[PDB]
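ERR on first pass: missing label on line 2. Operator R.T. fixed the label and resubmitted. Corrected input:
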Amino acid sequence: NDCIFEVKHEGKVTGYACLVGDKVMKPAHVKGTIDNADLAKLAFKRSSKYDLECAQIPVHMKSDASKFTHEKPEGYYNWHHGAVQYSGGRFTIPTGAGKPGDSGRPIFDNKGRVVAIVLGGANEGARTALSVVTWNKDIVTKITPEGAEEW
Amino acid sequence: NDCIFEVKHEGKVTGYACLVGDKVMKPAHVKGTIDNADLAKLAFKRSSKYDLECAQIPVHMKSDASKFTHEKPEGYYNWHHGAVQYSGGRFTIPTGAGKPGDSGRPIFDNKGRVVAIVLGGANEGARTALSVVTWNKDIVTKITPEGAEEW
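pass 2 clean. output:
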């Protein structure tokens, strides 16, 4: 728990919240409470449009936040469970690398810069196209491939 | 096609050569002739130390050369068959992504800069660690996992 924190609901980890820039971010559909009391007590706003819940990072934690970038060249990226391909405007991963529970994990570049947050994914056989919140032309956007389930 | 070229021997593609910086580079152990008349007629110098054959890229082709860098932060990089992981000072791939014939293919970062050239691989189970040529600013280096086999 430095920039990524478990969200828990009735004992079970249902997802993750992430510190990015000056925001605390969590997928809105992820049920439960962030298992950090400094975070859990913040003013959070829900946006259905982005499936995001956000709060201002507290003063004593601002410097723990992840760096981010709007720039995502086509290629491969990182998340907790391995490689993530970006091409065609879609993020994809090996099917099974991700499952219900991974919602909230960030996708980041080689310099540790967050480029997207994972919301869920659509099984397309061998690969899974991720549902994500990200920046397109520096504008916040939720991208959902057809047939995606919330994670 | 642009920066990558087939090497053929007695009809079969055996491997590849690539334009990098101001050099035509090719794994020395890869048999055959570069399937490009403008390149096959160059003066080639062979280094057994690096399993490299090199020549100066012709003038009318120097801008077709991709850039290269020494910068290798841990994470994922790109090659023709998918994602290449760099970590612990080693490049690895999912076993079965590479095979004899892949020697000479370059590994790129998201900026499209070459960070390594594939020489072969060592099957280590789920993953295969690549034998490569790679850079340290102005010096070149052969990195070879134990029991690697030439591709």
